[PDB]
Design a protein around this nucleic acid. Structure first.
Ligand SMILES: [Mg+2]
Ligand SMILES: [Mg+2]
Ligand SMILES: [Mg+2]
Ligand SMILES: [Mg+2]
Ligand SMILES: [Mg+2]
Ligand SMILES: [Mg+2]
Ligand SMILES: [Mg+2]
Ligand SMILES: [Mg+2]
Ligand SMILES: [Mg+2]
Ligand SMILES: [Mg+2]
Ligand SMILES: [Mg+2]
Ligand SMILES: [Mg+2]
Ligand SMILES: [Mg+2]
Ligand SMILES: [Mg+2]
Ligand SMILES: [Mg+2]
Ligand SMILES: [Mg+2]
Ligand SMILES: [Mg+2]
Ligand SMILES: [Mg+2]
Ligand SMILES: [Mg+2]
Ligand SMILES: [Mg+2]
Ligand SMILES: [Mg+2]
Ligand SMILES: [Mg+2]
Ligand SMILES: [Mg+2]
Ligand SMILES: [Mg+2]
Ligand SMILES: [Mg+2]
Ligand SMILES: [Mg+2]
Ligand SMILES: [Mg+2]
Ligand SMILES: [Mg+2]
Ligand SMILES: [Mg+2]
Ligand SMILES: [Mg+2]
Ligand SMILES: [Mg+2]
Ligand SMILES: [Mg+2]
Ligand SMILES: [Mg+2]
Ligand SMILES: [Mg+2]
Ligand SMILES: [Mg+2]
Ligand SMILES: [Mg+2]
Ligand SMILES: [Mg+2]
Ligand SMILES: [Mg+2]
Ligand SMILES: [Mg+2]
Ligand SMILES: [Mg+2]
Ligand SMILES: [Mg+2]
Ligand SMILES: [Mg+2]
Ligand SMILES: [Mg+2]
Ligand SMILES: [Mg+2]
Ligand SMILES: [Mg+2]
Ligand SMILES: [Mg+2]
Ligand SMILES: [Mg+2]
Ligand SMILES: [Mg+2]
Ligand SMILES: [Mg+2]
Ligand SMILES: [Mg+2]
Ligand SMILES: [Mg+2]
Ligand SMILES: [Mg+2]
Ligand SMILES: [Mg+2]
Ligand SMILES: [Mg+2]
Ligand SMILES: [Mg+2]
Ligand SMILES: [Mg+2]
Ligand SMILES: [Mg+2]
Ligand SMILES: [Mg+2]
Ligand SMILES: [Mg+2]
Ligand SMILES: [Mg+2]
Ligand SMILES: [Mg+2]
Ligand SMILES: [Mg+2]
Ligand SMILES: [Mg+2]
Ligand SMILES: [Mg+2]
Ligand SMILES: [Zn+2]
Lengths: 74, 136, 53, 97
RNA sequence: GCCCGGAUAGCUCAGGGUAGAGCAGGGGAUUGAAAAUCCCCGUGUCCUUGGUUCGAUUCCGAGUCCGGGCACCA
RNA sequence: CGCGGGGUGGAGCAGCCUGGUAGCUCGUCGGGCUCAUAACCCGAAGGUCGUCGGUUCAAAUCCGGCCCCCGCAACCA
RNA sequence: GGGCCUGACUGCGAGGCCUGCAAGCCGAGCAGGGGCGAAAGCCGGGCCUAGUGAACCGGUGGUCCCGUGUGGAAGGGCCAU
RNA sequence: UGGUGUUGGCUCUUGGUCGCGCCUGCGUAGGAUAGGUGGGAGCCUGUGAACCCCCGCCUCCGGGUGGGGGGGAGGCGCCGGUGAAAUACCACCCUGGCGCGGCUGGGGGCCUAACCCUCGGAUGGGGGGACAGCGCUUGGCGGGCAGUUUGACUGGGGCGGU
RNA sequence: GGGGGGAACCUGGGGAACUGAAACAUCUCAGUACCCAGAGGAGAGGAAAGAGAAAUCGACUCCCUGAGUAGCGGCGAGCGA
């Protein structure tokens, strides 16, 4: 009857604040906009967040507007 | 098969292959109707008519033409035969062979493709006259 | 795919090559797919018609 | 089921190959060999009885070389037979070969 | 896959014009318990889809399901 | 207990592959035939589909729980 | 919900996620030729995470690359399925 | 078990399927039995026209059609009406018959002389007989026999389940 | 004239299986082991109806090389000019 399960999907954010990232680096793996894309961040067809420029990762909590991942160029 | 049509049946050997050139010769000798006949060019096409794809429409003509430009048509019936005017009861020779030659070239321009040699059986006749075999 | 959802090819109507494979439901859509598609041999967009895969 | 007295044809061994499948030529996956065993192939030995010098003489010959029997009889219509026994007429006809 | 059957009314079945046969079930005559019998009904997704036709159960392209036989399955 | 099947008018069975429709025989009840009973003929009633839940616009039907019934299995010691 | 449409693109892919291998995922941006928009721009299918199967052998449509002395052909390769 | 070889002499009887002769093709509307297109305004008839004896062939259920006789100036078609489509005539063809000839088959019968059997006797007689047997080849049946396959997980294994 | 014998070697006629493929059937082992016939001091082979691309070579046999190449192959294990 039971016995089933599916593969762990290794979700979560992959770069924290202060980390230097090259451009297309993945920043968050997620389901839906747990984190919304911010400055210099794009969002792929599966809500993956990624840096659009070389820079320093920065997180922002904007209340009911959600949490945001940004990349600040250096 | 009355008296007239036999006279023309004396003028076409049944076991013979004729020429695009030979046709223009004999045709002004099977038009023994009492009017300026039209010359008809026939062919048994090598395709399936039931097959929606393989099919023959199209428009020619030139050079000379209908003479009733001179654009003629040709569409196969449900049986795979095509045939068409023109040509007339003179219309000199060497002026109709050219006409007869270019009609065969179309349809020889419209093999859908299909299976085989298109112009399987070909023929040339007059309105009230016998048939002649010819060579495409 | 299934009996009703089939696989099929798109054939550029100009040069008659198959440049795309895709699917359709032949009950909901019993008529050959005609779409516009970049044909890379013609190097322009062409109407492709549905062809049996 | 033995050896042709004219030609030397004897039984040979051959494989019997059983195959499944559709030939590539016919658009098939290919041919698979579902068994190879040994078997013997035999000459089409028959008996030809023949009257030479008023004597009945039998050759055990392959069908292919049957005409060669009455050939040797044709060449023997020129040597001293009568009165050889059948075995020695046989030897002499065979020498003509 | 190849060939031959099949899939048409409630049952069982006959067939480029079209939708009829025997029964099921309704009526009416027999004057009668019954069967039988005659006139009368008519219920038809004609297995889908596309196509040729004035017209397609029917023919042609592509499909589905069932039975017999054959063949094939990386 | 494990596997498979099943539970639907009063009885014995369809229906559920398949969602929208509950049908057949007998029985029961009202009427006829008969002096009367049966047989027979005409007409009608009676099922919310074991039960709770879920899925669905919609459940006899599909899915799950629970109850009960039937068949099979439970071996090497 | 409606209008117009076929980017359910072709040629590429910095960079990463994931990870024993192999696979699996995301991807800005460049060119071709398009769609929608006044434009900014967005579009390489679907809110996302299941809906799937390495090779081998073979079919089909391309390509015209190889072609057993030579030219062809047989047969194969390459691309697509 | 088919073909073929060994394997020969006569003979009857049929059936398929290609090629030219011929006809054949009918919903309802319509003159009425309209196969499909294309040509087509003329076409037949002194080489005998409209009809309606004889046949043959068919037919959809009205008729069509070929051969023969009878005869003793006429028939058609266009036009035009219904038509989805139009009629004569001609051509190329489709469907399905029909004779004639290709080819290819299955169902026989006799013969004797290969083969086979047999006769105190054998270059012969008798019996079987081109069958059977035997060679190559085809498909079939075929645990009679042969080679093997018949998964893993598992609170032992199996059963169950995955 | 033959017959019969001879350690191994040789040619011809026959011809396995364990095993490998980490199962197994094609494939492998292997034309091996073995049985049989024959020949000899050797045997086989040998003077192109050859090779195969050099307008080339020149009977046969044997070693090196070509080369684990070209290819063959449930394109597997392997086999292998
Ligand atoms: Mg369980
Ligand atoms: Mg897991
Ligand atoms: Mg998980
Ligand atoms: Mg995307
Ligand atoms: Mg901060
Ligand atoms: Mg064999
Ligand atoms: Mg093989
Ligand atoms: Mg003999
Ligand atoms: Mg022979
Ligand atoms: Mg009950
Ligand atoms: Mg139902
Ligand atoms: Mg009562
Ligand atoms: Mg009383
Ligand atoms: Mg329940
Ligand atoms: Mg609901
Ligand atoms: Mg409910
Ligand atoms: Mg209901
Ligand atoms: Mg409920
Ligand atoms: Mg035991
Ligand atoms: Mg025990
Ligand atoms: Mg495009
Ligand atoms: Mg990378
Ligand atoms: Mg990786
Ligand atoms: Mg982009
Ligand atoms: Mg652009
Ligand atoms: Mg643009
Ligand atoms: Mg605009
Ligand atoms: Mg733009
Ligand atoms: Mg949406
Ligand atoms: Mg391949
Ligand atoms: Mg190719
Ligand atoms: Mg060459
Ligand atoms: Mg070349
Ligand atoms: Mg490509
Ligand atoms: Mg046999
Ligand atoms: Mg022979
Ligand atoms: Mg012979
Ligand atoms: Mg006899
Ligand atoms: Mg025999
Ligand atoms: Mg056999
Ligand atoms: Mg067996
Ligand atoms: Mg056994
Ligand atoms: Mg073994
Ligand atoms: Mg075994
Ligand atoms: Mg297995
Ligand atoms: Mg175990
Ligand atoms: Mg445990
Ligand atoms: Mg324990
Ligand atoms: Mg256990
Ligand atoms: Mg088990
Ligand atoms: Mg043995
Ligand atoms: Mg092994
Ligand atoms: Mg084993
Ligand atoms: Mg083996
Ligand atoms: Mg040997
Ligand atoms: Mg050796
Ligand atoms: Mg010796
Ligand atoms: Mg020496
Ligand atoms: Mg020597
Ligand atoms: Mg020698
Ligand atoms: Mg010499
Ligand atoms: Mg290969
Ligand atoms: Mg393999
Ligand atoms: Mg070998
Ligand atoms: Zn194109």
């Amino acid at each position: 009857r039971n016995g089933r399960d599916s593969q762990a999907k290794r979700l979560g954010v992959k770069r924290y604040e202060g980390q230097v990232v090259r451009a297309g680096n993945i920043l968050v793996r997620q389901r839906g906009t747990r984190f919304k894309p911010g400055k210099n961040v794009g969002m792929g067809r599966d809500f993956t967040l990624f840096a659009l420029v070389d820079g320093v990762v920065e997180f922002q909590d904007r209340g009911r507007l959600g949490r945001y991942v940004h990349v600040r160029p250096l | 098969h009355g008296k007239r049509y036999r006279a023309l049946l004396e003028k076409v050997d049944p076991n013979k292959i004729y020429t695009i050139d030979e046709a223009a010769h004999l045709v002004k000798e099977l038009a023994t109707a009492k009017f300026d006949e039209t010359v008809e060019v026939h062919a048994k096409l090598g395709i399936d008519p039931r097959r929606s794809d393989q099919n023959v429409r199209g428009t020619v003509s030139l050079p000379h033409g209908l003479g009733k430009a001179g654009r003629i048509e040709f569409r196969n019936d449900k049986t795979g035969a095509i045939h068409a005017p023109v040509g007339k009861a003179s219309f000199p020779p060497e002026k109709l062979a050219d006409n007869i030659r270019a009609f065969i070239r179309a349809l020889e321009a419209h093999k859908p493709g299909a299976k085989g040699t298109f112009l399987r059986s070909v023929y040339v006749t007059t309105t009230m006259g016998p048939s002649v075999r010819i060579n495409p | 795919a299934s009996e009703v959802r089939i696989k099929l090819l798109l054939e550029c109507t100009e040069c008659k090559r198959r440049n795309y494979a895709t699917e359709k439901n032949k009950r909901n859509t019993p008529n050959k797919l005609e779409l516009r598609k970049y044909c890379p041999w013609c190097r322009k967009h062409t109407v492709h018609r549905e062809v049996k895969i | 089921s033995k050896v042709c007295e004219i030609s030397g044809k004897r039984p040979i061994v051959a494989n019997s190959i059983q195959r499944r499948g559709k030939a590539k030529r016919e658009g098939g996956v290919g041919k698979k060999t579902t068994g190879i065993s040994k078997r013997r192939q035999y000459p089409n030995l028959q008996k030809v009885r023949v009257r030479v010098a008023g004597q009945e003489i039998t050759f055990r010959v392959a069908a292919s070389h049957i005409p060669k029997v009455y050939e040797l009889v044709e060449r023997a219509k020129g040597l001293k037979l009568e009165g050889l026994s059948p075995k020695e007429i046989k030897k002499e006809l065979l020498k003509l070969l």
